[PDB]
């Protein structure tokens, strides 16, 4: 089964700022990382949301609606692992 060693860390983000959510997973085969925001897979087609590397998710110019829980999903045919962090976004 895939094992998540370092998971996303909770953070307070200001509106229009930039936040990064990283994730490190171990296993044979090499686990694939997927991101879920409030039970819905993070879009691969948003100009501001970039899935940099397998395990790193960057969100530039943060909206108020970006508030929620982000889940890091490590996938291989031998199982699946999850790690969650809540990201809150308030105005100035």
Numbering used by the authors: 454 to 545
Published text:
Roundabout (Robo) receptors provide an essential repulsive cue in neuronal development following Slit ligand binding. The Drosophila and vertebrate Robo1-3 are most similar, containing five immunoglobulin (Ig) and three fibronectin (Fn) domains in their extracellular region. Here we present the crystal structure of Robo1 Ig1-4 and Robo1 Ig5, together with a negative stain electron microscopy reconstruction of the Robo1 ectodomain. These results show how the Robo1 ectodomain is arranged as compact dimers, mainly mediated by the central Ig domains, which can further interact in a “back-to-back” fashion to generate a tetrameric assembly.
An inspection of the potential N-glycosylation site at N463 reveals no additional density. All five Robo1 Ig domains are very similar, the main conformational difference occurring in the βC-βD loop region. Interestingly, the βE-βF loop region in Ig1, which contributes two sequence conserved basic residues (K137 and R136) required for heparin binding (Fukuhara et al., 2008), is longer than those observed in the other four Ig domains. Rigid body modeling of the Robo1 Ig1-5 construct by adding the Ig5 domain determined allowed us to fit the corresponding SAXS data rather well (χ2 = 1.3), yielding a model similar to the previously computed ab initio shape. The Robo1 Ig1-5 has a Dmax of ∼200 Å, indicating that Robo1 Ig1-5 does not adopt an extended conformation and consistent with the EM map having a largest dimension of ∼190 Å. This constraint, including an eight-amino acid linker region between Ig4 and Ig5, provided the basis to model Ig5 in a looping back orientation. The flexible linker regions between Ig4-5 and Ig5-Fn1 enable these domains to loop back toward the N terminus before extending down to the cell surface via Fn2-3.
